[PDB]
């Protein structure tokens, strides 16, 4: 039952990958407090899951700090339960420097998450780079779109990481589901071949290439070279290069007043006129 | 080679080359309904697909994709993960996948659908092309303008020799459901009530099997309220049958007429014009005679010769109108890509698993347009 289970959390079996408690009936919040606990030290359990299980906010800070406090467990399912943002967040704050956890699930709560508990999930877990899915439906458009961007620069870093190590120098690299559809015969309507042929013939327009634009403007090469003009005087003859006395840059007096004269002014310090005409 | 095309209500997904889809199941990720609910659930956390359809009760259905925009990426992975492993029975590995799009995805979206494919099923090569667009070259076409009538959302998009033009692309707020909602509220204000999921799945089917576009509404409007030849019965399960009459035109009315549900928006009719107006005045002339329907909400009979009708009382009289309606616009999609995807010309489109490993996500804006 469930003693046979949190016997072996605490026992540290290693043999039990999996917490399944879904849909597990009379589960309290003491005894999923003691669960949270139980993993406090754990180092065997990767997947802890209840679903379905009367689960509140203290559960969850439960979990919460159990989160913290953990760093083998990559997946948590708090599904289907009576969760408020005020428990939520609880396990998201926690997540603000916990670099294992990996998947975290809370769908289909008691009421509607709140909006200011939304947006805050979003800037709460934008410190985080370890998360990788978020198994949560936003009714936001703003938080939403700034979730799933983090989610793909957090797993970008997995693609960014195998680049360095994984090839660079590595040697090498119950009742019915109303089912009628359509049995088959391939392909004999077509001609859209034309249009890839021309989709080879061309494409690329203009111009883009290279591996990074750390310098200026890498512009298309037609203004910079079609607008001759700027091409000051090449190859033959002035020479012009200005160097000139002997001044430096430590401490000015003339200057640095200037500076502070500058930095003291304002177009109300200048006599009025005026500028509207067009002229003919 | 596969497809998946995705909708914000039905899945469908085969290997390419293919005639139709071999999966087709609904686009849903069932999570028990609230309470005490065990009995229901054994061991799992949620239900995928015909399952989920299955059991509606203790259910409380969602739909990862929401007027074709993926909404929920952790169900989206759910549903792919479904397709792949239990409905299509392959492992995406050992395949390259065309997937779909709405038009006007974010670009944010067109990356996680790229990641989700390289990173969590490690495809070794893949490609995304805008629905409204596949639906086209399944018409044998590159050229033209395609209305994409769905679930959620309509769309009208030019298309101008193989690619989508966004400036031009209209979009509409009215689908599919809405006429079912409408149906439902007038068939009630009528007599028998429809609230139920489960009485609201016989609206869909009074709709379908008995709806049709009047090319004139004023006059059919009089015919039935003339004589009763516009009259037809249907036989509910209990066995009770029930007779709708100007209720068959008066609810795709509502896709030439969204005042009807109280729309300031304008009917599918002007969306295509318009659309057309702000598009080349040197390809005006092949969109015209190259509109072409997509989606189900298309359906109805009628609705291509009302179509042709209202867009040459827009349009200039020297134009040909041409509106063409596959009979398999339901699947057209899905067959659309299905072609691309066997097309020898189409191996070097892909997106290789190298270029995504070197570049990251972002490479699908430039290699798929
Ligand atoms: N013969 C028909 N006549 C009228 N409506 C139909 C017919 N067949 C299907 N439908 C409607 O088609 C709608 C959904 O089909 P479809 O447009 O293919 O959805 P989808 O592609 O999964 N969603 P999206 O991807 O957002 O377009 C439903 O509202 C159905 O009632
Ligand atoms: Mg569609």
């Known amino acids: 039952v469930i003693e046979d289970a949190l016997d072996k959390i605490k026992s540290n079996d290693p043999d039990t990958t999996e917490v399944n408690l879904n849909n597990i009936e009379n589960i309290t919040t003491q005894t999923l407090t003691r669960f949270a606990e139980a993993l406090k030290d754990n180092t065997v359990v990767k997947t802890f899951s209840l679903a379905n299980t009367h689960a509140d906010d203290s559960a969850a800070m439960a979990i919460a700090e159990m989160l913290k406090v953990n760093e083998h467990i990559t997946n948590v399912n708090v599904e289907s339960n009576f969760i408020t943002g005020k428990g939520i967040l609880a396990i998201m704050r926690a997540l603000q420097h916990n670099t294992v956890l990996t998947e975290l699930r809370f769908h289909n709560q008691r009421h509607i998450m709140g909006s200011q508990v939304e947006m805050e999930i979003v800037k709460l877990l934008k410190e985080n780079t370890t998360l990788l899915r978020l ?102 003859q002035e020479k ?14 003339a200057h640095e007043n200037l500076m502070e004269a500058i930095r003291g002014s304002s177009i109300k310090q200048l006599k009025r006129v005026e500028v509207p005409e067009a002229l003919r | 080679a596969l497809v998946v095309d995705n909708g914000s209500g039905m899945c469908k997904a085969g290997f390419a080359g293919d005639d139709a889809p071999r999966a087709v199941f609904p686009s849903i990720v069932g999570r028990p309904r609230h309470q005490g609910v065990m009995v229901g659930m054994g061991q799992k956390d949620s239900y995928v697909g015909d399952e989920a359809q299955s059991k509606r009760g203790i259910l409380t259905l969602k739909y990862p994709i929401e007027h074709g925009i993926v909404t929920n990426w952790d169900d989206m992975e759910k549903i792919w993960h479904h397709t792949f492993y239990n409905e299509l029975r392959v492992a995406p590995e050992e395949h390259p ?141 209990d066995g009770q049958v029930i007779t709708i009459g100007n209720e068959r035109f008066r609810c795709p009315e509502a896709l030439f007429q969204p005042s009807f549900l109280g729309m300031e928006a304008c009917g599918i009719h002007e969306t295509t014009y318009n659309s057309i107006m702000k598009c080349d005045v040197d390809i005006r002339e092949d969109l015209y005679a190259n509109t072409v329907l997509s989606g189900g909400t298309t359906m109805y009979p009628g609705i291509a010769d009302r179509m042709q009708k209202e867009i040459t009382a827009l349009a200039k009289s020297t134009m040909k109108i041409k509106i063409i309606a596959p009979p398999e616009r339901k699947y057209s999609v899905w067959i659309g890509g299905s072609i691309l995807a066997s097309l020898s010309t189409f191996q070097q489109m892909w997106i290789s698993k190298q270029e995504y490993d070197e570049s990251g996500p972002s490479i699908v804006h430039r290699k798929c347009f």
């Open chain 2, 97 to 237: 996948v065309l997937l779909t799009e709405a038009p006007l995805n974010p670009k944010a979206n067109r990356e996680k659908m790229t990641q989700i494919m390289f990173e969590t099923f490690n495809t070794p090569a893949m490609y995304v092309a805008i629905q409204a667009v596949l639906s086209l070259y399944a018409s044998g076409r590159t050229t033209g303008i395609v209305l994409d009538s769905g679930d959620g959302v309509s769309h009208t998009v030019p298309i101008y020799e193989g690619y989508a033009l966004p400036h031009a692309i209209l979009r509409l707020d009215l689908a599919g459901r809405d006429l079912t909602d409408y149906l439902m509220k007038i068939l009630t204000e009528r007599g028998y009530s429809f609230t139920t999921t489960a009485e609201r799945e016989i609206v869909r089917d009074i709709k379908e099997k008995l709806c049709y576009v009047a090319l004139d509404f004023e006059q059919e409007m009089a015919t039935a309220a003339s004589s009763s030849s516009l009259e037809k019965s249907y036989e509910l399960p």
């Open chain 1, 135 to 236: 198994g949560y439906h936003f009714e936001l458009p703003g938080p939403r779109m700034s979730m799933t961007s983090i989610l793909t620069r957090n797993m970008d870093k997995q693609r960014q990481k195998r680049l360095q190590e994984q090839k660079q120098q590595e040697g090498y690299d119950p009742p019915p589901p109303p089912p009628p559809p359509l049995p088959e015969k391939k392909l004999i309507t077509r001609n859209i071949a034309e249009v890839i042929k021309q989709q080879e013939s061309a494409q690329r327009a203009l111009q883009n290439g290279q591996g990074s634009g750390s310098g200026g403007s890498v512009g298309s090469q037609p203004n910079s070279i079609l607008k001759e003009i700027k091409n000051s005087l090449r190859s033959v």
């Open chain 1, 240 to 253: 012009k290069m200005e160097d000139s006395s002997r001044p430096s840059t430590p401490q000015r007096s």
